[PDB]
């Protein structure tokens, strides 16, 4: 009698294809802050972080994180909800910062220490420290290092990189093998691009070093930041961090590795010069190359510099996360929320849409509302598909989830 | 009670077709998609294809030529698979099964049609 | 081309635990299933979801998937247990994979 959560797996059969402009999709459901959530879904095992803050809600003080995983469950009346039984704390809030992967009868959530602040706001403050903490999928009575681990990896195999860290929400089980996000701190001075790759073409504003500078946190900036997956053998603590190839080269911004009708698809945020949602499956994950999605339609909120619908190289660090998931394979019809406004975080939409097309929206909230940070999880519950998203709707101020079911008639 | 049921033993020449159907019943045809597996006397189950009641696009099928073609009639709620040029390796008990949870499992399948390919 | 290889002869003694494994590349991840057809029967799934139930079955049934493994496990075989069981996946690259089949003799 209780639908039981599964990866979104199986032929579509009913589907809804073809543009609809009616309103067919339902979002169903002080002095503190609260930022840089996580969420990440698989096969029923959801997790929850964030990190409190009191007052300024982008350099307040750091309150204190919260790492959690509980089991996705139907409310009891057929609608998906999200249910927590573990929780747990660090005991210095403002070190562990910038935090999750699905292994059986575990939850790997691979964290960074940082004493000083945000590795991306001052990165030679920063030293290289990597935590691991790992939460019990199901709580278990004298268990003991079972039910909760804090693991500090004593190296990690970076590379060119001088320090990497975990940078993106949730990540992929390819087997036995787990897998993070993570951002590469790569110097500047080591990173090589050819101007040529950057097409200045179509636009006359633009200038060739765009693409590199634009990769920094500024022009001066000490560190390129790459996005790539970061590894670990849990038979076997050696990381091998794992980086996107060149192909539609951007910052690293974070990343949802993700696995939809069984592959790896990726996403990454429009922090660099294309504020063009760019998106895709996985063809190889050990070593990175995504097929960007041929998304050109659907973008974000921009400076003046690199504002909302921006194709020209300009150099700009400004963005927001707006991830989607794939729906279906054929059709690639993917579900994803953006904010509707060319140089501000208001007016996001629950977008159902294709590679030159949208299928159909709804109004999150009003066109003044404020939210900037958006995690949408795409899950299948008994042959519907259905998506749970996360978004910090803003007028006390806290990110919070609500589901919608996909429509499979276009009728 | 949910079942597919099909017709009779049928004994085909070579080369020539015959007709399979898939009665739905107990259950209403357009929720799942019914899939289609032959049984081969003495081996193993084999998917065939894989047929949309609802769309009714082009039905996926396993790899090979277009001998099997898939159909159906929403009306009378029935599948139907056209074998045509039958072969006398083409032959077993072939079932019908909907894909009751999608890439889950086979929740219910058909008591099977014994196609002979007798010379 | 996807593969889910079963070993084909199984025995065991009544009272005693049965085990047959699916070894198929990364069976972590894909969603498997499990059929018995005793001779001259249509197929009946017993086991799913890698842990779960369906509706109106024994309980003696139990399954686990592991790296490239997926095992079903009976506690303790009776007389009906006599029969060819089956085991599938859904794969999105190639279809709907079955295993070849095995062979559960039991003595008495």
């Known amino acids: 009698i209780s639908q039981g959560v599964s990866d979104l797996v199986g032929l579509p059969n009913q589907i809804c294809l073809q543009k609809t402009t009616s309103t067919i999709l339902k979002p169903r459901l002080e002095g503190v802050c609260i930022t840089d959530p996580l969420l990440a879904v698989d096969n029923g095992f959801f997790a929850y972080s964030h990190l409190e803050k009191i007052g300024s809600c982008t350099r307040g003080i750091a309150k204190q994180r919260i790492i959690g995983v509980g089991e996705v469950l139907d409310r009891g009346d057929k609608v998906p909800s999200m249910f927590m039984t573990n929780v747990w704390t660090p005991p210095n809030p403002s070190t562990i910062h910038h935090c999750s992967t699905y292994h059986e009868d575990f939850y790997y959530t691979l964290c960074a220490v940082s004493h000083v602040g945000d590795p991306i706001l001052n990165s030679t403050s920063w030293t290289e420290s990597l935590s691991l903490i790992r939460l019990a999928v199901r709580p278990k009575s004298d268990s003991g290092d079972y039910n909760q681990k804090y693991i500090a990896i004593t190296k990690v195999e970076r590379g060119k990189y001088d320090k990497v860290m975990p940078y993106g929400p949730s990540g992929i089980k390819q087997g036995d093998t787990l897998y993070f996000p993570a951002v590469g701190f790569l110097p500047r001075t080591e990173f090589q691009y050819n101007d040529s790759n950057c097409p200045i073409i179509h636009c006359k504003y633009s200038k060739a070093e765009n693409c590199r500078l634009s990769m920094g946190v500024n022009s001066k900036s000490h560190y390129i930041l790459r996005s790539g997956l970061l590894k670990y053998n849990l038979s076997l603590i050696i990381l091998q961090f794992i980086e996107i190839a060149d192909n539609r080269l951007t910052i690293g911004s974070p990343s949802k590795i993700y696995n939809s009708l069984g592959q790896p698809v990726f996403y990454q945020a429009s922090y660099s010069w294309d504020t063009m949602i760019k998106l895709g499956d996985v063809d190889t994950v050990d070593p990175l190359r995504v097929q960007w999605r041929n998304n050109s339609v659907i973008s974000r909120p921009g400076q003046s510099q690199c504002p909302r619908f921006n194709v020209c190289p300009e150099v700009c660090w400004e963005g927001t996360y707006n991830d989607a998931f794939l729906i279906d394979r054929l059709n690639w019809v993917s579900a994803g929320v953006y904010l509707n406004s060319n140089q501000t975080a208001e007016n996001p939409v629950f977008a159902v849409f294709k590679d030159n097309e949208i299928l159909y929206q709804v109004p999150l909230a009003e066109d003044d509302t404020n939210a900037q940070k958006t995690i949408t999880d795409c899950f299948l519950l008994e042959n519907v598909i259905w998506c749970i998203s996360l978004v910090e709707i803003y007028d006390v101020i806290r990110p919070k989830l609500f589901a919608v079911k996909i429509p499979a008639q276009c009728s | 009670q949910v079942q597919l049921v099909q017709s009779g033993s049928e004994l085909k020449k070579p080369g020539a077709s015959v007709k399979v159907s898939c009665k739905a019943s107990g259950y209403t045809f357009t929720s799942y998609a019914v899939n289609w597996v032959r049984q081969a006397p003495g081996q193993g189950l084999e998917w065939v294809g894989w047929?949309?009641?609802?769309?009714?696009?082009?039905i996926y099928a396993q790899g090979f030529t277009g001998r099997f073609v898939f159909s159906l009639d929403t009306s009378v709620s029935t599948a139907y698979l056209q074998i045509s040029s039958l072969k006398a390796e083409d032959s077993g008990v072939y079932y019908c099964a909907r894909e009751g949870l999608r890439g889950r499992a086979f929740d219910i399948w058909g008591q099977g049609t014994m196609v002979t390919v007798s010379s | 081309s996807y593969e889910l290889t079963q070993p084909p002869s199984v025995s065991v003694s009544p009272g005693q635990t049965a085990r047959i494994t699916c070894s198929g590349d990364?069976?972590?991840?894909?969603?498997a299933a499990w059929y018995q057809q005793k001779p001259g029967q249509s197929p009946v799934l017993v086991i799913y979801?890698?842990?779960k139930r369906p509706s109106g079955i024994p309980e003696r049934f139990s399954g686990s998937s592991s790296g490239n493994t997926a095992t079903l496990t009976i506690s303790g075989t009776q007389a009906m247990d006599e029969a060819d069981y089956f085991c599938?996946?859904?794969?999105?690259?190639?279809?709907?994979?079955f295993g070849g089949g095995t062979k559960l003799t039991v003595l008495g």
């Open positions: 990364k069976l972590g991840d894909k969603y």
């Open positions: 047929m949309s009641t609802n769309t009714g696009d082009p």
């Open positions: 979801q890698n842990t």
């Open positions: 599938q996946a859904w794969d999105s690259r190639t279809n709907w994979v």
